[PDB]
Every structure is written in structure tokens, then in C-alpha cells.
Amino acid sequence: APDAASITSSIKYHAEFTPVFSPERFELPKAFFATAQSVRDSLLINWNATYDIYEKLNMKQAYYLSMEFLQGRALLNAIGNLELTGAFAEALKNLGHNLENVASQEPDAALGNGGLGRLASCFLDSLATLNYPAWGYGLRYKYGLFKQRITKDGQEEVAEDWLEIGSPWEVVRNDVSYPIKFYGKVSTGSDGKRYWIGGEDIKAVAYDVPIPGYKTRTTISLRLWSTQVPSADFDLSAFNAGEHTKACEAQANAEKICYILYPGDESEEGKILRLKQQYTLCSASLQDIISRFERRSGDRIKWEEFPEKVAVQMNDTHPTLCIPELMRILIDLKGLNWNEAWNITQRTVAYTNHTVLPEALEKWSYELMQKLLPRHVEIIEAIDEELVHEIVLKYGSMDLNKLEEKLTTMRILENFDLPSSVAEIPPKKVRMANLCVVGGHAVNGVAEIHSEIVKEEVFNDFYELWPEKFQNKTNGVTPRRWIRFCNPPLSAIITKWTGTEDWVLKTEKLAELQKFADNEDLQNEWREAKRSNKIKVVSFLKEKTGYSVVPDAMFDIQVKRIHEYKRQLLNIFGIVYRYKKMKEMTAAERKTNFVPRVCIFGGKAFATYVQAKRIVKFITDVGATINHDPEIGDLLKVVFVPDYNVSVAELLIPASDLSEHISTAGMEASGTSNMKFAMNGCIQIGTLDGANVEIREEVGEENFFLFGAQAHEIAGLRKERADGKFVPDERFEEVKEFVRSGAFGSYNYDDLIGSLEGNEGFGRADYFLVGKDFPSYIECQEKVDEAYRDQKRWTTMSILNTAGSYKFSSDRTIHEYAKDIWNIEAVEIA
Amino acid sequence: APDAASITSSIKYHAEFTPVFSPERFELPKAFFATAQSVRDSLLINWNATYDIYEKLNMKQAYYLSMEFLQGRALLNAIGNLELTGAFAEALKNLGHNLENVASQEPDAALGNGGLGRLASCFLDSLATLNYPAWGYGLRYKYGLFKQRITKDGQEEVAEDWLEIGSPWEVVRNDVSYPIKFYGKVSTGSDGKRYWIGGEDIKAVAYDVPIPGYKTRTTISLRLWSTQVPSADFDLSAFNAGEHTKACEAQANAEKICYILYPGDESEEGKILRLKQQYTLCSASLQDIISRFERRSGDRIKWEEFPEKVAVQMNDTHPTLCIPELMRILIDLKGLNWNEAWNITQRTVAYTNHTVLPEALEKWSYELMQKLLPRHVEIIEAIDEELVHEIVLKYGSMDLNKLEEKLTTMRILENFDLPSSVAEIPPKKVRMANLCVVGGHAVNGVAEIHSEIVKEEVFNDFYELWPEKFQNKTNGVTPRRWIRFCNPPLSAIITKWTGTEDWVLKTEKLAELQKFADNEDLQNEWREAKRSNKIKVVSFLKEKTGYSVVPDAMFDIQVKRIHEYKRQLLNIFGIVYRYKKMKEMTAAERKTNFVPRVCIFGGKAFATYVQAKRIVKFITDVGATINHDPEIGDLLKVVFVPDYNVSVAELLIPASDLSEHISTAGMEASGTSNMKFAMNGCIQIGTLDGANVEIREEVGEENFFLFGAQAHEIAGLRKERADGKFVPDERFEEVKEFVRSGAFGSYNYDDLIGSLEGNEGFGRADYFLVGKDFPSYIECQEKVDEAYRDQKRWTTMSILNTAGSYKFSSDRTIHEYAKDIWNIEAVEIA
């Protein structure tokens, strides 16, 4: 086991012997690389030890596939899970640095975007920590999505540079390479098997990122694919003639599959690039999974045993091509019959749904997919045809009307002709969501209410047919990254009041804080912990936003994707309201009527989403005006934090007092940031939707600020709008006027306010009900104000958040998947 | 100091902890990577120790710049120079491999092409070994020139894959990065300095390759530049719209500068790419050199002392832009006056010429260079104008005719107008060779005769003007790579007969073999050494060419660039002759009249050089026919070895009996393979040109087979041809007829024989005098036959080659450059 002495030598050894810099001096960037390489040594011993037990045991292994992982920085979670935090800190002191400054050099791995990606990242930590044999498979994106610049003009986008020097975590596996084919033609050989020939051939190379469990040796992989072409595909003859671009066409074509996350797909070229990404991920992974299955099998290879050895989870519909890809391999490559290969594929694959309404469910042009993946389209057509025969077999054809409904709704192919049928220019599509439901043995939503909606409204017919595939797995986040490592002072408190350090594993012990919520010593520690965390943030806000704020103010935080439906605009409108009120009062009245606040916004706008980009500019202009107004001073600051990512979350969430989750009611499946906020003793204000419902139930309805229309009323209120029956509240008109009056400078906001007016019209008519919800929202912010002035009641609420947060551990989620869907069991790594 | 035990641990440590493969098993590719990383640990300790002494001493340092380095494999020369060969061999045995199989995994560094590149590589070994503070600067070419495939159709070209997995030698210096500008505009600031703004900006990143000296710690760098663009230059907005190619234009543009060696430049785009390559190399290097000069200087920076601290050698005219680049930096960036910066530039820079006639001397379109490098063109124009004023100042203007001659010949700018002058549509060019002579303080040829030609015929006027710049530095090759490490059995012999291992440093002790050339014990060892080396080659010829040959045959070798002027066609024609004679004789007569031979060819043809490609196909067809003819059997084999490179040279040269250097007399400046052949006891047959002249003089005229027209007669014989006075010898017509008769299969050779006929016409008329030289060549091969049957006389000749080879050590060459041009001195690394 390393100690400070051996870690000291180890960093020095890497600094000199695995250098990435000049040999002079030991600057911070050099120190971070040497440190991380040192940690990797530890990760690799454990990774190899886990790898060896898994190989010999040949137990069932799970595989979690996703277009995104939001891994964050690795250093502090890795030394923490290894329990070497102390030793690395002391070793860095010896070499003249501190831990925190060295950790600051690490770029966030830009491998994901939002909650879908952080959920997968949480899950990997949970799997490793719980000794579950499972890996992650994703793509290695060179440039992420974008790094966000916050200028005078609002948001600007720049390519991420996280791999500009390389990652000291990843391990290239030069011998783990899989061929990926696109386009080409299918024919039949004299063996009666299909053979897919020609098109474009590329290679997918494996890059492992070791994921260490907490207090265990289990160290699993996140295996990422990077796409390339052998150097032999460089066309010399072209290059030498002066056609430099034609010479590299094959490499250009291969490499771009892994440039960015979710490449813009309004164009044909963008759509093709998206299918290529999904297919690469499904093909490379399954090829890798099958190859490991054959290797562990030895001579005793029973293809029958494949689903007893392999689970594959599809995170959303992006991994959908797994179903026809596994079918392809079994049938075309392994020689299985259709029936055998379908039974196998079904008992292998499971689908998790993450969306609310049947309109974000992905669909592909038939012609497009047929050009790119001819063999996959044959297989899907056959799956569709069996489905048709199965639907006719139940239900019969006495209802014709009932049969037609079922066939129309449930078929994978849209706007197609039936095989055989009875009665005596729309574009042909492939419904990925239909495929996923048909092709696996489990389908789960991601919250109680959500999973009920999936059974009742997304796939009702599928549930009437196969009620037994449908399940719920409520999301969760890891308390390692999201309490133990991001919030040390609160961790020290939890350990004291619960009696042990055991809570990080047995997170149910957070419940033992409830009996102390009114205890005055607990409360005092609780407040000093919160204040200390906010002091760290004050320094951070100074360097990142340029504004100096005080820690004796409520930190009111709204961090998430910028979208009209997320309702940043509501929050900022509320802010503008209070600022208007402040300005029409004396100094003395201002202090009696409003508690001091720092309102922190962060999150990225999709770059061609004009309105979202306009909301960002808006927040920055409201902040320029408020934060410089000498009548206001430290009563109110509005700051927009550039480039929100896991590292910024880990800073902000420990420090937060109030966090806002105020999307239009009914449009969130779950959300997970609210769960991290609760764990850290933040109090949530929000609408009754998504994860807010479950949080509110666990933390108690007195420790949550609720407001707004509920899901069941959205329909009616939008009808009111359309008929002209909607009466905007005057305070709402006040803010509107105030913005047009130009109080926020010279920028013209007409286009923005216009989105809130009219009664119909594509992007007008206040579709997300900002104006409606506004009175109950501003009202509820006054309840907050009142609660915050009662420091004792506020602390009690803050503690009960942390106390009622245990069920939101991704350890709970992962045990559920492990028992109810994947049927994997813990494996000990001695 | 490492031993077998610590090297064992070290390989294991890297195998597990700096992995590039899967963790299963220890296959050869894994073993080579772990081994090389282990060696690098040793190279790095010494490199850092050398770096530290150089930094503190701040003595004068030399810099050798070249478009090519032909580094070969590094492993065996590195463990040899470190003296760990034994320890690494034993360590590999312990882990179940042998040294020779592990060394076979290493790709040759594809960083060069021909002798110009191997000379630089020899020089780096010599500098390090002699404790001279000097570095190499070159480009890091990803795909080399091409990897040569030898098929049924002759030569095919494929991109080199040497960097497909990465190099375990190189060290990326992420903090050593220099901006390179192209295009743009020049203006004047209010300080009166020129400012070069706009165009295209890229970055050149440093990759060090440590070069260890023999039996010393001095370990120097070959620092290679690789070109790139910050990830910020990736155009997201384009990428997201579907314009994937436009999005990466800047990276595509930057990266291609380092794809291949000598990109085809018939097109504008190819020419631009060549200037970009040269400029990148001169700019990045000088920026690095100057930055190190300022850093070592501290606060005491005297720009006056720069040429007392820095020598820059230009290997040929490709580094020519160094002259205006240094001028640019001093003037525009450092604020020096013109005069000061010109004095400095002159005492810094030196030019080595490598070509014979004033027609391969490089020239650039004025307009082209002006578009790409506007500021450099201003500076060159000013240098030209001073030259003009200087020429007028000597010579005066009484001869007008004499003055005009001088001005026309010597000016850097061709087809330009004079500033001022007196008398009362050709494209404007920049003569790089004129620039190089004007801009440095030394000019050297590369052999006695050559350097005399440079003074008398290439730059006569420059020599009449500045006789003192002109010098000679006869080339040499290193006896580490080219005796001690490629030919172990011969090394054991040299050590025994000379009394010590000291010959590897004091290579003059090879002369002590002369007194033993007739000694029968020396001769017996000598023969067993040669035979043993040929046994290694027999195995190699089996796997690479597919032909099985016997070691009891003279190995007759011709390895070099395939070119009409190199005269492979003569050799193969001689072979075809003897084969024709063999076939018209009985078995018994065949054995009396011809000694058994294995005729080995190798070398690359420029890909669009139709004739050269046709000569390769020819040799392969002659070999298919001879090698399969049951009348011939092991009397004669003709094999073409694919992909000749340093690794193939190191195999073939130790094994060789006769090597052929038979270019048209007068067209070689030097050549260096002939010197390596001599060192290994090969006997040369050749024309009286280049290095052959000097070899023949040292080894003795009885130990060299000479034939052919001499340089002074080429002119006359080509005139004979043109006037119709040339009478082809009948034996030459025999071979011609025999080829057309289709004895070499179905390929049509008309186009090839046609190059030998007619009296004029671009590519006919036997310009390189194959037909002329043919009788004396076939005659001289019979003298060889006769000498080879007298094993005693043959051995005596073989030994006197090795005995008379010392002066061809690049250690001799490097001491000469060090004292006579660069004025650097040895620095001890304790």
C-alpha cells in the first residue's frame, strides 16, 4: 500500500521518466501529469487484478452503452476511492504544491453533455464500488460538445481542448481493434448465409478509462472507441499530384465520427454522421463483448449460454442498433438460426427510456438507413414482419378497427404496406423506440410517475401485450463524487453525527440526522460548513465571472441546459421584478423587505437555438446592470457562470442554499441535479414534476418550495391561451415594460418579449407558461425570503434535505438493475 | 548502472505500467515496446545530465538542419552505445524472448530517404560520441516517403505505418511550441520596424529523439517538429451545419506539412507545400535556438555574442530560408540594425553543397515566394542589392562585359532589373544556392574532387570573390552502426587482431590489419565471419523475396535509389548476358566458366518515373526466369529485396562480397554506402567517380575493380552519339535482342530498350552510356570471377578494404566541421 514517501518518489519518477514537458522546473501542469500517472499505476494494478478474476470466473457481465458519459475530473475521486487522499496531499507538499492547485489543472473529460451522461458516470462508480462485473462503452469525442465562452454578446462556442496534450488516465489498447463497415451491398453465399461486402471500411480502437470502486479493488473499465483508418488508406498517388484533400478522404471520413457530441443533423451529411456514430458504438462494443465471451468460453462454446453470460443495457434509443447488430453477428457470422439468435438477442438486451412524450423518440428515414446499413434493414424488416404476425395472432381480426390501431401504433416501420391483410405521399421511416421495446426483455422509466407514463401513454399497446417487460428504476447519483469528495466539511459532520464513516457505503445512515435537525450544535456546524463552502465559491466567482460577492447572502442557483422549457426566463424575470421593487423603495425599506442574495446561473445553449442564446445574453445584461448599481450593492448579485460542467457543479452544489428546478410541469422525466443538491443540504424550489416529486416526498413537504400549474393542467391552460381567455398578471406586464424601457442597456429584447405574446404562432404565445406561473413563482420566492430570515427553521430544512436524500444513491439504483434486469452478482477482488 | 536483474524488473514494470497493449501474454510487439521504454529510461537520465551541463556552461552549440534523417532502428545502437547489450539480452531470455526477435519488431524511423539523410544520422552519432554540444533539427514525417511493395507488376507504393502505434523513443515537449506564419501582409509601425500580420497561423511542436554517444553519457537531441493548429481553430459552426470538410480546413492545412518527404511538386499546391515545409523547419528551429540563447544568457544578453554561441549548418539548400529568417528575427523582433544582424547571420550560418551540376540547385518562382513569405522576399531583395553594390565595388565598370557576366551569374534574383547601371518574357526567380553562398561564412563540398568542382564550376565567381569561404569535408559513416553493431563476428576479429576494443573510437587502428592480410589464421576467421553473415541473409531472403539461395556463392549487391543514371540497368544487362552464355554451354562448361552468385538488388523508384519503375519490373522478371531455370540451379540467383532501408542495409552489407557503384562517371558527388561496404570487407566494383575515387586510393588500386569512361570523356561520347558516330558492341545488341525475343516472359520491354536507341530525343539515345560502358563492364565482371576463385587473393583484398576504411569514419568528418567551420569544443558529462 503506497504512503507519502513512495508516492513522492513515484511522482518524481513519472515527472522525469514519463515526461510530457521540458525537464526544467516543476510547474503546475507538469505536476498534475506526473501525479495522475502515479495514481494510474494504482488504478492499473487493481484493473488487472479485477480483469484476471473476471476472466477465470466467467460469470455474467453487464455492459452499459451510452452516447454520453459525463466523467468530470478523475483525480480526487480516484485517490479518494483508493483512500490515498492524505498520502498524495503530503507528497505534493514535499514537492512544493498543494493538492487543490494540482487538481485544478485537470480538464473535465468532455465525453458527455447532460444528465443522461452523468447518470451513466454515477452508475460506473456504483458498479465498481458494489463489486458488480460491468463495463461502460462509449465513443472518445475529441472536442466534446463545446467549451462555453461568456462575452459581452452572451454565449460563444469553442471546440474543447481536453485532449490537446492527451489524457494521463486513458489506456490505448492497440491490439483491441474492430472493423466497422458502412454502405455496400448484401448477397447470398452457397451456404445460404447473407454476406455484406464493399462500402467503407474503418477501424474502432479501444481506449480504457479505469473506474475504481470506493474502498475495494474492483476497478472496471469505461472503454471508449476512437475511429481511424490504417495508414495504408492514405492515397499517396493523389497526395503527390497536389490533391491533398482527396488523399486523406478516408481518414477524414473515419476520424470525424468521433469529433463532437450530437453533431448538428439538419443536413443529410449530419444525419449520416449520427447513424455512423451510433452504429460504430454498437458494432465495436458488441464485437468486443462477443470476442470476450468466446475467449472465456474456451472449447466449451454454447451460444445458448450467451444471455447467461452477457447483459447489454441501452441507455435511451441511441444504442438501438444493438438489436439488429447482435442478430447480424449470430446469424451471419456464427451460423445460428433466426429463432435461436432472436431468443438470445431478447434475453441479452434491455432498454431504458428517458423522455416524456412520443415526439422526441428517434426515427430514421428508411431510404437513408437502407443505404448506410442494408443488412440491418433486412433484419429490422424481418423483426417487423414477426411483430405483425404476432399482433394478428393475439387480438384476431374481428375488430379490424382494433387490429389496425394496434398494427399502426406498434409496427417498427412507419408508412409501410402490410404483408397480408384485408379490406375487400408520406415518407417511410424506422421507429427506433418501437424496435427497442420489441427487441429486449426489459423496458424501464427513470421515476415512479415516468415509468407509469411509459406503460400508459408512450407504449400502451406494448404494455397490454408484454406487461412483464415494463419496470421502473428511479435514478440516483453517487454519494462518493457528490458528498464525500465534493463536500469535505459536510462529510466530517455526517461522520460525527452518524457515528461512523460507513454512510458513504450504507447511505441509509443519513436518515439518522433527522433526530438532530433541531439540535443547536449540529445546526452551528451545519452553518459553518455551508459558509466555508461558499467562501471557496466567492473566490471562484471572482476569477470566472469577474464579480465580487459576499458569502453572507443566500446562494440561489439555477444550473442546467438553457431552454425555454427549463424556464431560466422565469427565474431571471423574478429577479428583474425584485430589482424593480428594490429601486422604488428607500435603502431602509430595501433591507427590511429582501434578504441578500447571489443568484447564480450556468448551462449551455444549443448554438442555433436563437432564443436560448438570447436568454443567456439577457441574464448577463441583467447582471451587468444590477451588479453595478450602487443603490443595490451587496443586496443582490446576478452572475452567469461560464462553461458549467461537473467540476463547476462540484464547487457550486456544496455551497448552495436554494436551487431552482422550475420547468413547465410535466416535461421532466427525472432530472438528477436536484438529488445532488438535496444531499448537500440545498433546499429546492420547483414545479411538481420529474425528480422534484420524489425529492419532495422524501425530504418532506415542509422542506421544499412548491409552486405552479401541475402536469394535468398544462393542456387546459394552453387551450385558454389559444382561445384568448388568458389574463396576464400586471406584475408580469411590469417586467415586460421595464425590459422594453431599455433599463438593461442598448440590446433590443423585442424578439424575446415577443415570444411571450400573441395567442398562437410557432414560437410565440408563451407556450411554456412563464406568464401564467409567474404570480405563484414570485409569491413563493417571498416565502423563501421569510424562511431564510429564520436561520433556525432554515437550518432545520437544510438538514432534513440531507437526511431525506439516501434513496437517491445510485447504489440503490444499481442494485435494482443488477437484481431485476441484468441478473449479475457481486464478485470479490481479494 | 543497470544489470540483468534491474532490466528484467524494468521491462516488466513498463509492460504493466506504461502499457500499449492488452494485459494478456507477452507477445513480441508488447516485448519490444516495454524493452524500448526501458532503454529510454537510460537515455533520459543521460539526456537530462547532458542538458544540465550545456545549460550552465553556455558554451557554443552547433545545430544541424536537414529535410531528412535516416535514423533506422534505435534499439541495438542505443543498448550498444550504453554498453548494456549483454544485460538486455539476458533480461529478455528471462522473460522468454531473444534480443534479435525483439529488435525485429522495431519499424525504421521513416524520417529520411537517401544518403543525405543517413549522413546526418551518422553525424549525430559522431557528435554525441565525441562529446560535441550539437543537436539535429528536422520534421516529423508521419508517412515517410513510401513503403515499397514488390509485386508481380514491380514496385507499388504504400504509406509508411511506422507511427501507427507511436514511437517509444520520442519525447513530446508540449511546452515547446513555436508559431509559424504563412501569406499575410507587411507594414511599418511608428517604431520604423516591419510588422508581418495576417495570413495563416500554425504551431510547430517539438518531439525529441535522444541520440546516445558510444561509451559516454553525452546524449544529444534530434528535435523534430510536428505541425498542428490549436483545437480552437476547429470551426464548430461549419461542422454542425454539415460542412465537415470546411470545419477542419485549418487542421488539414497544418497537418499535411508533415505527412510525407518531398511531396510531388509538379503542381502549384505541391510547390507551396514544399516551401511551407522548408520554412517550418527553418522558423521553428531558429525560434528554438534563439530562445535557448536568450535563456542561457540571463540578463547579460549581448546579441553580438550570438555567433560565438550558435552555429547553424545548412544541409543542402532546403534550409536556405535560415538566412532571411535569422535576419527577420534579429531586425524585426530584436531591434538590431541591418548591419549588425547581417554580420551575425553570416558568422552563424554555413552551407554544405551535395550536388554536382548547376541545374539541380533549387530555385523558386519569385511571385510564389512573395505570396507565401512577403517579409523574407523583402530581405532577400535587400541582400541581393548589397551583393550588386559589392560586385560593382570590386571589378569596377571598365569591362562592362565582365561586370555583366558577374552580375548575371552571381545575383540571387534571376531575370530582374538592376538598381542603377549603364548601357547608354522570362519568369522572375530566386536562386537558393546563390543565397546560401552569400549568406554564410563557409561553403563545403563532400569529397576532394567535388569541393574542387564547387570552387571551379558551380560557384567560380563566388570563389574568386570570397575564396576563403570554400572548404572540403569528405563524408564518412559511423563505425558504431556500420561495424560494431551490424557486424558482430567481424568486430570480434578486429578486437583480436588489433589488440583492443579501442578501434570503435580510434578507428585508425583498422590500419593494423594490413600487416596480417596474408596471414592464414586471420584469413580463415575472416571467411567464417563473412559466411556466418551470409547465413543470416539466406534466411532473410527466404521470407522477403521468396527465393532460397546458398551461402557458398558470391553475394553481388547493388542497393541504391533506382535511376537511369545509377545504372541498375547495366548490372542487370550484365547478368542477362552471363545467363545467355550459361544457356549456350554444357553443365560442365557452365561450372568452369562462372563462379556461383547471388545478385541482390534493392532501392526505390520515384513513383512517376516510368522508366525506373520499368527497370524494377525488369529485374524481377529476370529473377523469375533465372531463379526457376533448372539448367541454372544454384549457379545464379537474381533477387530484388523490397523496401531497402537502414535495417536491410545493416543485414546485407555485413554479408556482402562485391558491391556495385557504377553510375555514369562524373554524376556522383560522393555516395556513402561504398564506405560502409569497404568497412565490412566488401570489394567494390565501380566507375571512377564520387567516393569511389577516394575508397580506391585508400584501399589500394588492386583491391577495387574499376571500369568505364571517366568524367572528362562523358561530353565527347555523348557528342559521338548525337553525330551518329557511336558503334554499339555486338554483345550489347545480343542482350537487347534476347529481351525482345520474350525470354523474360510476356511483359513488353520495347519501351525500355527504346531508351537505349536513336541518336537524340528527350528520353532515348542512351544518355547515361549503358551501351558504351557495357564491354568494359562485362570484361571487368570476368576479372571478378577470376579473383573470386582464388580464395586467398580474394580474402587479402577483402581485408585490405577493412584495413583502408578508417578515414571514412564520420568521427573524422565531424572533428573537421567542429574545428574548421563551427568552432565548437568537446564538453565532458561526468
Residue numbers in the entry:
A (entry chain A), B (entry chain A): 23 to 446, 511 to 916
Question: Which sentences did the original study use to describe this structure?
Answer:
Starch phosphorylase (EC 2.4.1.1, α-d-glucosyl transferase; SP) catalyzes the reversible conversion of starch and inorganic phosphate into glucose-1-phosphate (Glc-1-P), playing an important role in starch metabolism in plants. S. tuberosum phosphorylase is the first starch phosphorylase discovered3−5 and has served as a model SP for biochemical studies of plant phosphorylases. The most significant structural difference between the Pho1 and Pho2 forms is a 78-residue-long peptide insertion in the middle of Pho1, termed the L78 segment. The stPho1ΔL78 structure reveals that activation of the enzyme occurs through the proteolytic degradation of the L78 segment and the association of the two remaining protein segments to form the active enzyme.
The free structure was solved from two different crystal forms that belonged in space groups P3121 and C2. In P3121, there is one stPho1ΔL78 molecule in the asymmetric unit, whereas in C2, there are three. stPho1ΔL78 structures from the two different crystal forms are almost identical, and since the structure from the crystal that belonged to P3121 was resolved at higher resolution (2.2 Å), we focused our analysis to this structure. stPho1 is composed by 916 residues. The crystal structure of stPho1ΔL78 has been resolved at 2.2 Å resolution and revealed similarities and differences with the mammalian enzymes. Except for 23 residues at the N-terminus and 66 residues of the L78 region, all other residues are well located within the electron density map. PISA,65 size-exclusion chromatography, and native gel electrophoresis indicated that the biological assembly is a homodimer. The dimer interface surface is 60,640 Å2 and buries an area of 5980 Å2. The monomer is composed of two separate proteolytically produced segments, the N-terminal (residues 23–446) and the C-terminal (residues 511–916). The two segments are held together by 27 intersegment hydrogen bonds and 288 van der Waals interactions. The essential cofactor, pyridoxal phosphate (PLP), is attached by a covalent Schiff base linkage to Lys762 in the C-terminal domain. The crystal structure of stPho1ΔL78 indicates that the two fragments are complementary and that the enzyme native conformation is unaffected by the break.
